Amino acid sequence: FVAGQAGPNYPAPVEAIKTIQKAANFGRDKALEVEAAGFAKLAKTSASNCLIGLFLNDQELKKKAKVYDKIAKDVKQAAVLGAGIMGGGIAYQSASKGTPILMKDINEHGIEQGLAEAAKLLVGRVDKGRMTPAKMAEVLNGIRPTLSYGDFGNVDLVVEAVVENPKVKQAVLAEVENHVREDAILASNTSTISISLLAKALKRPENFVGMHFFNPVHMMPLVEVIRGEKSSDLAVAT
Amino acid sequence: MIYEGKAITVTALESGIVELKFDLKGESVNKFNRLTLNELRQAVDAIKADASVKGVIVSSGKDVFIVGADITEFVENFKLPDAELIAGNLEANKIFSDFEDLNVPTVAAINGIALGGGLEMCLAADFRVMADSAKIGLPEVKLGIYPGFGGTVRLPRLIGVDNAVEWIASGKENRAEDALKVSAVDAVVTADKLGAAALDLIKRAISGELDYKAKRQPKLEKLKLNAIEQMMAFETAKGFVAGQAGPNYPAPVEAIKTIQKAANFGRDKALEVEAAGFAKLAKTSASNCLIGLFLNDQELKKKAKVYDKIAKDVKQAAVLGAGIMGGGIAYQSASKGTPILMKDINEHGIEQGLAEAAKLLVGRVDKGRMTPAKMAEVLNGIRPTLSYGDFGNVDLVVEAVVENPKVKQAVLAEVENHVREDAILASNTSTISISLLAKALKRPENFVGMHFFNPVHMMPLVEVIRGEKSSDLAVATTVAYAKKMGKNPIVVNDCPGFLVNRVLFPYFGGFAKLVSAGVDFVRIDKVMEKFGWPMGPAYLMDVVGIDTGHHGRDVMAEGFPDRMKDDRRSAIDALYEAKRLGQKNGKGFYAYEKKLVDSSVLEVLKPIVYEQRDVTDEDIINWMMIPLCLETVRCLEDGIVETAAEADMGLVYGIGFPLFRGGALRYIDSIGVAEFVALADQYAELGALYHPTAKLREMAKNGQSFFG
Ligand SMILES: NC(=O)c1ccc[n+]([C@@H]2O[C@H](COP(=O)([O-])OP(=O)(O)OC[C@H]3O[C@@H](n4cnc5c(N)ncnc54)[C@H](O)[C@@H]3O)[C@@H](O)[C@H]2O)c1
Ligand SMILES: NC(=O)c1ccc[n+]([C@@H]2O[C@H](COP(=O)([O-])OP(=O)(O)OC[C@H]3O[C@@H](n4cnc5c(N)ncnc54)[C@H](O)[C@@H]3O)[C@@H](O)[C@H]2O)c1
């Protein structure tokens, strides 16, 4: 079972079994001798020190992370400019964790697709026994659809999910910076367009950075925080 | 061909099999009128002689299969003497019986809706094939009667006593899936394949594969149940229905008592029991009343087609409020498929709105009545907001702001600047004039009144108030948007109290007088709830709230001083001045800790008890009904409700008028327009609220009635 879901590359998983398999007829003493014997064998394997290195790198990361939290602001009101694929996903993740996120779009049909897939996910688990409907409601209440920037009055961070087009993105982001606060942080989700370029449109590029999510937004872990030449430390930290 | 009528065509087919199709040329649907019964009669006698016949397949040429006969013919038939009516069914059932005793395999191809006699027709056959997109049922009880064409005889023996009692006592339609489970149908197939389904089945019966003689036997003999089992099977059924229907509707229970008698008889004697009871129910002073509602319904539908010619669909609704009424209106709108906005000045407001709007959907999901996938859709339609930024494409707005003319004018006016010009505005006020709140807008033409009730998701009625500056399109749009939310809209001209409220208080006036007359209110509402009312006058004042019934009184006073003014102190005042405010406060006529009689009220109602006049029950009924009815009469003469049918249905949905009585106006007809006038003079010593009108007295002389 393990060999088919782990791979011949990870010795530890299988060695643990072989160990228990040998001491299957011994007492505690002889069992311990089999335990330590295998422990030494794994402590020298190449997969060991590497996995150990991963966690070794994890610590350094969390340490750097703590440096950000010293100036980072807690977005108590998020907002995304889009829906459907990426827009809806970003609106989902934000709500699923406890962050009222807005869903702005130029057409009603767009907001439809956004809420559509954002619903198939929650219900997709309730119809299996993994989430309480009471929770599905809370999540669906955090997401607030809109066709105007009238509710962006208190957004702490905006994520642009508009189509890949520098010309367009500049007109959009610029239009948003007029409604949002001045301390508010803007962000782009582009994957093939320069941030430093999309930043020359804003009148306050300091509060602009890059937040690159992946497809699907609710499955992929990584979220690159791109820093433009005009980006500030606070913008990135946030 | 073998036979050819104007509603039935019997065409021959392969292997001797012959098809009997129900196709009423000229009309849209099929139904057992006087003609069809005669043509089917000849059709059977034709197949009964044709020796080349090897099987019969009953089909339908129209969309639906076979629905109930014309409602108009029903009334005409339910006036004939009991002896003549029984003979009408005794000979009717004979027709279907002959098709049943036909020495040849018979199968029905239910392609579409098969209700009332339609299903009874199929029951006569041996086998039954149904299209998955069809529905079958016996909605006979929806009129105060039960299956008269052998329904109460063949169904119980085909699908079992219990299942039969349900299908009959409820009169609900049944989907394809459920129809097969109870064996009401023998097989379900796609629409296109329904044809061969019948043909293939016939051949498998003729050859002997499917013993049709044995499958037909069950409904030609006594029930299979034990005597002991029968005792329970019926008594429990009776006890169940009687506890969820009420002693006011005979049909539901009579059906059971019928099946209970024929529980040991064959088809013949069973039919004798069916017809016997059918005649008994056809004469009840409840049956024709329910039938009256069916008529009023048809009148509303025809008028409905009028508004549906100038009403723009509301693909984007929006309400200015939340919490109680605002949240409800936002719920109903979304629950039916209409993205509705929720505007509010403070965030806490939107909180309450979405709160209760959530406890409703989740309230059903946690019971197995709604899919979470649906709960999401509904919660996605509701779009909270604190600004008018999203009102750019709203087709209709409903104001749920607190009762305050000054405020409502500032709000509505502010909205008209953001919404389009063709957009329709509306008010949900219950104690404020629309014509007054309309003088603030620069386009009063697009302004009307949409009055919902509490709770918004429970109450059916939705009055469509029309201001002096209101347009026909504005009204029509509101009606359609109301009907689309699964409601029952009825246009009402702007006036203090409108329709429901204008009749509710004069009704409460009789209550106030009773209390002041030393009449125990606990007894009063016990006679009213027995009369048919869901909740008695007293217990009703608590549900609505004394503080509410008090303000509403003042509104009706300044509105109709000539007959609705009062200078004395009623029990309504004794409570408002005793911090007692109803169910919300936990203190009214009863104590609400769920409904107890507390003697701590006697010390408060003393200042109201004037005389100590004696009184029976029949009096209480008149001390209450006379005012309500007479007022309804005025709401028709003065020119408020366009018709009499709409007038009654307005109460049937709003105040919850006893269904087995038809309504306020029809109630007068039940007792007689002329006799009612005399009933008004006997208690005329109680004010103008008990004095008939010059028009009510006149029509009482000509013998005319409201629904003649
Ligand atoms: N292929 C992928 O799935 C993928 C992978 C990685 C990154 N991305 C990033 O995602 C973004 C594109 O998002 P998508 O995949 O949902 O595209 P999409 O075409 O699926 O959806 C575009 C949405 O943006 C809305 N929109 C467009 N212009 C708008 C404006 N001016 N204001 C408001 N709403 C507007 C549209 O109405 C629509 O709802 C890009 O930045 C792209 O680099 C996509
Ligand atoms: N007794 C009842 O329950 C009952 C029965 C019938 C009809 N009504 C009608 O219902 C209405 C009262 O509504 P309610 O029960 O929600 O009152 P409420 O006091 O419970 O709630 C008022 C809500 O309206 C919001 N509001 C106030 N002014 C606003 C504005 N300008 N724009 C947007 N939102 C605004 C408030 O923030 C609040 O959320 C009245 O018209 C009343 O006649 C009530």
| Atom in ligand 2 nearest the alpha carbon of residue B414 | 31
Short-list B490, B508, B142, CA closest to B292? B142
Short-list B496, B498, B453, CA closest to B647? B498
How many Å apart are CA B577 and CA B607, to the nearest integer?
11
What is the crossing angle of helices B673-682 and B664-671, to 10°?
100
Interface with B, mutate which of A128, A136, A175 (most B CBs under 10 A): A136
Residue B31 sits at φ, ψ, to 5 deg, of: -165, 155
Strand-strand pairing, A78-81 and A157-160: parallel
A147–B388 CB contact, under 8 Å: no
DSSP state at residue A207: G
What residues of chain B lie within 8 A of the CB of A79, using their CB? Answer: none
Q: Are B147 and B259 in contact (CB under 8 A)?
A: no
Q: What is the three-class DSSP state of A186?
A: strand
A136–B372 CB contact, under 8 Å: yes
Q: Are B524 and B619 in contact (CB under 8 A)?
A: no
DSSP state at residue B66: B
DSSP state at residue B655: T
Q: Are B251 and B141 in contact (CB under 8 A)?
A: yes
Residue B286 sits at φ, ψ, to 5 deg, of: -130, -40
Per-residue 3-state assignment (H helix, E strand, C coil) for B582-630: ECCCCECCCECCCCECCHHHHHHHHHHCCCCCCCCHHHHHHHHHHHHHH
Domains defined along chain B, listed by start: 1-313 (3.90.226.10), 314-497 (3.40.50.720), 498-702 (1.10.1040.50)
Burial B372-410 (b: 16+ CB within 10 A, else e): beebbbbbbbbbbbbebbbbeebbbbbbbbeeeeeebbe
- Report the number of secondary-structure helices (H) and strands (E) in chain A: 10, 7
Experimental method: X-ray
Closest residue of A to B315, CA-based? A108
Residue B24 sits at φ, ψ, to 5 deg, of: -80, 95
Total residue length of chain B: 708
Q: What is the three-class DSSP state of B231?
A: helix
The residues pairing with B188 across neighbouring beta strands, listed in sequence order, are B130
How many Å apart are CA B131 and CA B190, to the nearest integer?
6
How many Å apart are CA B214 and CA B274, to the nearest integer?
24
Dihedral Cα B253, B257, B259, B260, nearest 10 deg: 140
> Using only C-alpha atoms, what is the Rg of chain A?
24
DSSP state at residue B174: B
How many Å apart are CA B570 and CA B550, to the nearest integer?
10
The strand ranges marked E within B179-236 are 187-189
How many Å apart are CA B180 and CA B183, to the nearest integer?
5
Short-list A180, A157, A35, CA closest to A90? A157
How many Å apart are CA A113 and CA A82, to the nearest integer?
10
Dihedral angle sign, alpha carbons of residues B568, B570, B572, B573: positive
Residue A119 at interface with chain B, using a CB cutoff of 8 Å? yes
Chain breaks in chain A (C to N over 2.5 A) after: none
A137–B384 CB contact, under 8 Å: no
Structure-token match 């699964």, residue found: B486
A212 an active-site residue? Answer: yes
Token readout for A25 is 């007829």
User: What is the CA A17 to chain-centroid distance, rounded?
Assistant: 35
Dihedral angle sign, alpha carbons of residues B148, B149, B150, B151: negative
Residue A171 sits at φ, ψ, to 5 deg, of: -70, -35
DSSP B515-573: HHTT--HHHHHHHHHHHT-SS-HHHHHHHH-HHHHHHHHHHHHHH-HHHH---S--HHH
* Residues whose CB falls within 8 Å of the CB of residue B136, separated by 6 or more in sequence, listed in order: B110, B113, B114, B115, B118, B119, B122, B130, B173, B174, B179, B184, B185
Q: What is the three-class DSSP state of B181?
A: helix
How many Å apart are CA B435 and CA B259, to the nearest integer?
58
Short-list B652, B280, B297, B340, CA closest to B485? B340
Token readout for B519 is 């009449």
Q: Distance of CA B683 to CAs A205, B508, B624, B679, Å?
A: 84, 16, 11, 7
Nearest-5° Cα angle at A37, A33 to A41: 170
What residues of chain B lie within 8 A of the CB of A148, using their CB? Answer: 387, 389-390, 392
The residues pairing with A216 across neighbouring beta strands, listed in sequence order, are none
| Amino acid making up residue B581 | L
DSSP A47-85: HHHHHHHHHHHHHHHHHHHHHHTTT----SSEEEE--TT
Token readout for B182 is 């109870």
How many Å apart are CA B463 and CA B498, to the nearest integer?
8
Cβ-based burial of B673 (10 A; exposed 0-12, middle 13-18, buried ≥19): buried
Q: Of A80, A81, A85, A215, which is best to mutate to test ligand 1, by the most ligand atoms within 8 angstroms of its C-beta?
A: A85
Short-list B323, B343, B333, CA closest to B415? B343
Q: How many whole angstroms from B66 Cα to the centroid of ligand 1?
A: 53
How many Å apart are CA A110 and CA A190, to the nearest integer?
18
Residue B13 sits at φ, ψ, to 5 deg, of: -135, -160
DSSP state at residue B286: T
Residue A216, preceding peptide bond in cis (omega within 30° of 0): yes
